[PDB]
Write a protein that binds this ligand. Structure first.
Ligand code: HEM
Length: 82
């Protein structure tokens, strides 16, 4: 099924193990991609656990990168949040 995640639940995934984040109300686990991500782990980590939409777009990310993101899609932002 799809499953949605609350800001809370996503928040708990900001550290040492699980880097989740929200881009455009869509939740992405990239925790295993930290080193792999050619923008550094640190910035992903720092932005983990919440809205990183503005950060993501402010940096800017190609079509490839946008499509890549979907491969790391776990679900969406809970309809209670938005
Ligand atoms: C949706 C998940 C993400 C994927 C799949 C992804 C993928 C990529 C890829 C492939 C690039 C290379 C640039 C391109 O070809 O577009 C990149 C660069 C970069 N990303 Fe991400 N990214 C993600 C999320 C984020 C987030 C949340 C941040 C914000 C903190 C971030 C910050 C950066 C930075 C700073 C660069 C390097 C920009 C530069 O120095 O030129 N990324 N990313």
């Amino acid at each position: 099924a799809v499953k949605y995640y609350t800001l809370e639940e996503i928040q708990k995934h900001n550290n040492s193990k699980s880097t989740w984040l929200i881009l455009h109300y869509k939740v992405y686990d990239l925790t295993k991609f930290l080193e792999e991500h050619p923008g550094g782990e640190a910035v992903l980590r720092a932005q983990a656990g919440g809205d990183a939409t503005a950060n993501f777009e402010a940096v800017g990310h190609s079509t490839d990168a946008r499509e890549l993101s979907k491969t790391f899609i776990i679900g969406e932002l809970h309809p209670d949040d938005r």
